[PDB]
Amino acid sequence: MPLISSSIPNLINGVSQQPAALRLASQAEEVINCMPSPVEGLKKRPPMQHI
Amino acid sequence: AARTSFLDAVNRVLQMLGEAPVNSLQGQFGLAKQAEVALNDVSRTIQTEGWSFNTDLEKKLERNSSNEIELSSNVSRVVVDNLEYPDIDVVQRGDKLYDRKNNRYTFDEDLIVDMTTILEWDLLPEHARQYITIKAGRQLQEAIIGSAELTKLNLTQEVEARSAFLEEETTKSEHSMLRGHLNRTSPVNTYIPSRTLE
Amino acid sequence: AARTSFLDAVNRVLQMLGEAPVNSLQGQFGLAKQAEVALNDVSRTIQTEGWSFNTDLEKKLERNSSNEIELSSNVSRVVVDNLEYPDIDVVQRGDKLYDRKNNRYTFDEDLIVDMTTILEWDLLPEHARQYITIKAGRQLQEAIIGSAELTKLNLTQEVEARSAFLEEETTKSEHSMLRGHLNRTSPVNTYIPSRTLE
Amino acid sequence: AARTSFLDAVNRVLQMLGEAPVNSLQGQFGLAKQAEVALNDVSRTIQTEGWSFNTDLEKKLERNSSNEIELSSNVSRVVVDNLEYPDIDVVQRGDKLYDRKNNRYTFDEDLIVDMTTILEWDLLPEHARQYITIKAGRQLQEAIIGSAELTKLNLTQEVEARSAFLEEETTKSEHSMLRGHLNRTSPVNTYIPSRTLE
Numbered sequence: 001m002p003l004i005s006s007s008i009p010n011l012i013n014g015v016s017q018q019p020a021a022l023r024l025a026s027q028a029e030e031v032i033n034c035m036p037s038p039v040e041g042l043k044k045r046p047p048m049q050h051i
Numbered sequence: 052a053a054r055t056s057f058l059d060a061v062n063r064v065l066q067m068l069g070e071a072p073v074n075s076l077q078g079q080f081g082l083a084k085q086a087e088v089a090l091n092d093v094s095r096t097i098q099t100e101g102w103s104f105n106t107d108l109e110k111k112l113e114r115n116s117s118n119e120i121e122l123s124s125n126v127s128r129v130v131v132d133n134l135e136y137p138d139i140d141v142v143q144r145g146d147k148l149y150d151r152k153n154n155r156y157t158f159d160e161d162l163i164v165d166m167t168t169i170l171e172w173d174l175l176p177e178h179a180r181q182y183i184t185i186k187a188g189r190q191l192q193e194a195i196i197g198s199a200e201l202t203k204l205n206l207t208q209e210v211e212a213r214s215a216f217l218e219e220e221t222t223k224s225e226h227s228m229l230r231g232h233l234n235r236t237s238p239v240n241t242y243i244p245s246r247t248l249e
Numbered sequence: 250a251a252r253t254s255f256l257d258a259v260n261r262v263l264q265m266l267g268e269a270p271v272n273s274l275q276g277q278f279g280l281a282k283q284a285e286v287a288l289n290d291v292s293r294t295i296q297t298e299g300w301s302f303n304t305d306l307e308k309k310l311e312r313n314s315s316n317e318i319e320l321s322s323n324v325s326r327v328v329v330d331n332l333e334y335p336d337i338d339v340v341q342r343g344d345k346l347y348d349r350k351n352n353r354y355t356f357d358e359d360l361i362v363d364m365t366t367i368l369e370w371d372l373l374p375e376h377a378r379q380y381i382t383i384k385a386g387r388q389l390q391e392a393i394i395g396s397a398e399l400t401k402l403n404l405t406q407e408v409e410a411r412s413a414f415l416e417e418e419t420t421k422s423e424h425s426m427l428r429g430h431l432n433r434t435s436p437v438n439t440y441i442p443s444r445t446l447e
Numbered sequence: 448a449a450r451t452s453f454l455d456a457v458n459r460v461l462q463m464l465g466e467a468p469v470n471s472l473q474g475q476f477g478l479a480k481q482a483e484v485a486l487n488d489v490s491r492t493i494q495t496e497g498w499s500f501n502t503d504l505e506k507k508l509e510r511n512s513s514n515e516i517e518l519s520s521n522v523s524r525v526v527v528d529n530l531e532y533p534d535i536d537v538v539q540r541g542d543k544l545y546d547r548k549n550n551r552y553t554f555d556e557d558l559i560v561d562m563t564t565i566l567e568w569d570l571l572p573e574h575a576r577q578y579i580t581i582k583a584g585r586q587l588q589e590a591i592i593g594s595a596e597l598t599k600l601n602l603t604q605e606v607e608a609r610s611a612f613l614e615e616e617t618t619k620s621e622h623s624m625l626r627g628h629l630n631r632t633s634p635v636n637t638y639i640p641s642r643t644l645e
Contacts, residue, residue, distance in 0.1 A: 001198035124449040
């Protein structure tokens, strides 16, 4: 038993419908109201103003 | 803080395996049933040896109409006194006794034997509960995952638990070497050589 | 600087596990449940062995209307002196005593026994609290994480804590060999061969 | 909590092997055939040695119309005392007894022999069932998978099981050295030096 670890490098790859055994581990499962960008990573979506 | 209960023991086994605790035991949807099975199996394995709390002495056994001795479903071992019965010796076989010297399944009168019973989880005392819990946890973990270092750690804990259990049993029952076989009523005073000299 | 509290013990267990300390116990949103169950289980395991701070001497027990002795919920072990009752052999079973020799659940008279109780957290003394905390932390870390270096450090700390707790217990309760069985009222003077020669 | 059954035994063997537990024995679609054959073979290997629970004393054998001693098909070994019969040396050969000294298959009179029988799974006692189960599991895993850590774990478990089984057998069968050959009816009293000096 080796107690060993990895890491998830990026969270900027969105949602996939493939079975979990064929995806890139980076890909997520359900994304709502996020704005994934390469300049700051994952963040809450910008607000919507009124005119 | 009461004595250990079935749900607490199941949760402890699951936690020792390393998996999240359960809420109840009825209508669950996890490994709790397998933990229960392992607990029962280890309980049977430990109880089938014969200890102070599950042995009945001087017990009298009764025969049925066909001159046979029948045993309950939870009887583990029986012993007859060779000195008391010189011409008959019995050995357990399934649920009936066999007079192996006379090669017969039938006896002539009743017997006075020593009986060991396998008990349910409710009647078990505290130290037996603890030993059973630790042993079942170790065995189930080995059966499910199959590591080696985890087995080493569980072996260390099991050794400590067995030491505690044996110490508790020998402190409770107060065995002796002078008294001989316990089927004879105690004539010993065990008079103390240490104190009464002043 | 008062004695250690339950929240301080939980914080110490979490810190030894390697996590951040938690604010409270009530309505926690963290590992408080795991820390609490670990501490309770280790407290019960330590208490069920029987020490000088949780044992009562020559306590009287009273039977019910059916000549049956029923124990409380938190009674761990019951000892009956053999010499005082040469015809009765009892062993604890669940919450009732069992007349092992006569194979009965009934008695003929009240008894004088010495029992061991399991105490709540608030009523424990300081050395017991320290030993309980350290052992619980070690067990929780070993079961949950399973690393190497943390296990080594916890092993060393547990060994030191056990040494300290045992030493404190023995110097508090002054166990002796000359006095023999403690149920006898002290006839000993323990006169000192190291003083009166001048 | 009744005694262990065949289905529980095969489930335990599969669990030791590391596979998922199987449901039934009849019309199975798993390793049930291999587990059953391993259990049967280990049971036969253990039973052929001869113990105290499967041996008949001073049993009488009868010859056929041609002065030939035909044994049953589940007779493992036959022992004939030399001192009683000083002119015949009998050894087992297949299913009939052979006169080694005289080089004949024919006898002159019936014999009084001590013979061992192979018992079915239903009739075995609990300790025999436990030891047989553990040994069969170890053998099957060793011959089928052949890994290292599993082999060492099964080795430790088998060693513990053998110790327990041997101790249970000896305490059930009260073997002695003063009595001599067990064929004689007990003239022994085993007067204990421990008791009667008061």
